[PDB]
Design a protein around this nucleic acid. Structure first.
Length: 276
RNA sequence: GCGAAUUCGCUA
RNA sequence: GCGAAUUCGCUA
């Protein structure tokens, strides 16, 4: 077997988005606030490259590619696991056929010290929300239980539509003053519970849970720099998507945390820069 | 983003 | 095929 090189893709939010530019009124998420990040595993050294910006939703992020380890070996089993996850990142999370517009892999702390997050990779592979919508069995006697902690750093998908390609959302807010019995913003339905019952024939087992504000996960491919009728229509679609209020019981939590998802969307730009 | 309708520009 | 304008449907 040939020896490996491991690089960390360092990310720091060096210029937070100014208020005048925060049109979608998002929270800002510095990548450096969470330890799990991405790295690159290669058989060749990567030539030294200067720091460069990607322009994300939260502002300008400085990217630095730094050597974490070299000269070590990995077993075939681990290389295959890493390979599957690289493919997973581009085919299932970003849904992209051309990663650069050798293997990206997750790194995490073992104690302020970055290494390949094998456990995280294994958890992904075991997740029932790994690809699509996981089965659930909420009944009156075994109802849905809302745990706030599970929604703090979550990406969620609706369990009740778009089965072939689910819409993924960041949880942007937890509305504790709302429940499924809150008033529905349309004269056609009295409550959120009635909407989901009438539209989808969905029953709820928990009428006390808070509701959720969401932010679509969609990102443009090239973030290396900071109009039309069609772009207008798309912008209007994204606005309505972001006005949606969802019911936790009716959604599934994706195994990839929001904090890591926010970093993943930078990957195509970074690989493009490295290759071109 | 996935669709529809109507109208206009680019070829000889 | 490469573009543009106007209008409508799908999410809560």
């Amino acid at each position: 077997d040939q020896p490996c090189y491991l690089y960390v893709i360092g990310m720091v939010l060096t210029t937070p988005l100014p208020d005048e530019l925060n049109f979608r009124r998002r929270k800002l998420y510095p990548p450096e606030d969470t330890t799990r990040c991405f790295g690159i595993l290669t058989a060749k050294p990567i030539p030294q490259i200067p720091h460069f910006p990607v322009y994300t939703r939260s502002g300008e992020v400085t990217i630095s590619i730094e050597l974490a380890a070299s000269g070590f070996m990995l077993s075939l089993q681990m290389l295959e696991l890493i390979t599957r996850l690289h493919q997973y990142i581009f085919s299932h999370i970003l849904r992209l056929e051309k990663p650069a517009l050798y293997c990206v892999l997750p790194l995490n702390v073992v104690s302020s010290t970055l290494d390949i997050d094998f456990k995280f990779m294994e958890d992904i592979e075991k997740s029932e929300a790994r690809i699509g919508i996981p089965s659930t069995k909420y009944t009156k006697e075994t109802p849905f239980v809302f745990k706030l902690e599970d929604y703090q750093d979550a990406v969620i998908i609706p369990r009740y539509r778009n089965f072939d390609q689910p819409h993924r959302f960041y949880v942007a807010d937890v509305y504790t003053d709302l429940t499924p019995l809150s008033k529905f913003p349309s004269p056609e339905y009295e409550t959120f519970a009635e909407y989901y019952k009438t539209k989808y024939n969905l029953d709820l087992t928990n009428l006390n849970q808070p509701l959720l504000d969401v932010d679509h996960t969609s990102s443009r491919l090239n973030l290396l720099t900071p109009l039309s009728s069609a772009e207008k229509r798309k912008a209007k679609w994204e606005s309505l998507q972001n006005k949606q209020i969802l019911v936790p019981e009716l959604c599934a939590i994706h195994p990839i945390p929001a904090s890591l998802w926010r970093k993943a969307v930078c990957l195509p730009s970074i690989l493009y820069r490295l290759h071109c």
